[PDB]
Amino acid sequence: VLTGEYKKDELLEAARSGNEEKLMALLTPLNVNCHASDGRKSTPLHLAAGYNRVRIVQLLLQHGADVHAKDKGGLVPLHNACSYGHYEVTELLLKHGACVNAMDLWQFTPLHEAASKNRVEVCSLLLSHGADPTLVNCHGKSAVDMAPTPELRERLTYEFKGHSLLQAAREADLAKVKKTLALEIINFKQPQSHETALHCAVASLHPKRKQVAELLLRKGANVNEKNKDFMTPLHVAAERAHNDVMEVLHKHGAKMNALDSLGQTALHRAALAGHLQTCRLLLSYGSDPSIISLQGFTAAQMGNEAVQQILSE
């Protein structure tokens, strides 16, 4: 078997050089998965992938190349493609079922290869087929650790969480969707006060507070979130006469009769402040003026004679 030894060398050479005609004259079911004798003992597929021979990769795969075959160091062809930034080769290999987190004898994955050589686009492609950038090699190092810029480190993390969310969504895996979303900031809380961004926005003196409030609500803000003193955003807006945002909160389902820790509604706090239009609006929204606070007061009992007048109707 010295002919299939020389023939092999020529098949390999055709693969490496991108010689399509020579490849298909030499490629049989007996040498399609042959390994070189010296060097790294690459298969044709390894060589075609490393040297970016896209058409050769198509033909090899089409004629039974083993996408999981190993070179002397435990690299699969996906390693070769990723290490030298061959995007389209990478995509082809993945399309034919390459293991996105295949590990060589040093526990290097394809993403270790791409990340360490700053193959930004290859990294994103890998992450989109489920590459995991937290897996460590024999030196205790992840793809994140080898990425040479903060922009790329941030991107590996962001895109990894992103695709874990997308896949959990595809699988309707509720627990996994919850988990990957556990760190969303929309309802992040001031640790001391328990206020969220919505509480802060409706308290704002600044001109765009209406727009900010709308935006936070569109993006998941809990309209009835309670701070340390059981104040909802409505309570906060009402006591400051921030009428524009009050409307926004109403629109998004604010509970008009929410009670703070003193048993007061937004209407109590507006009345107490002497905010006349605020009281009119709260009334129109369905606030209940009979509610008796824990100190024994209706809103009218805490307000000026104008508030009293407004409330007695």
């Binding site: 070179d71 493609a81 930034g85």
Partner: peptide
Amino acid sequence: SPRGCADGRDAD
């Protein structure tokens, strides 16, 4: 065991 380099070449 110094890890080698995959067979292949950068484009261009």
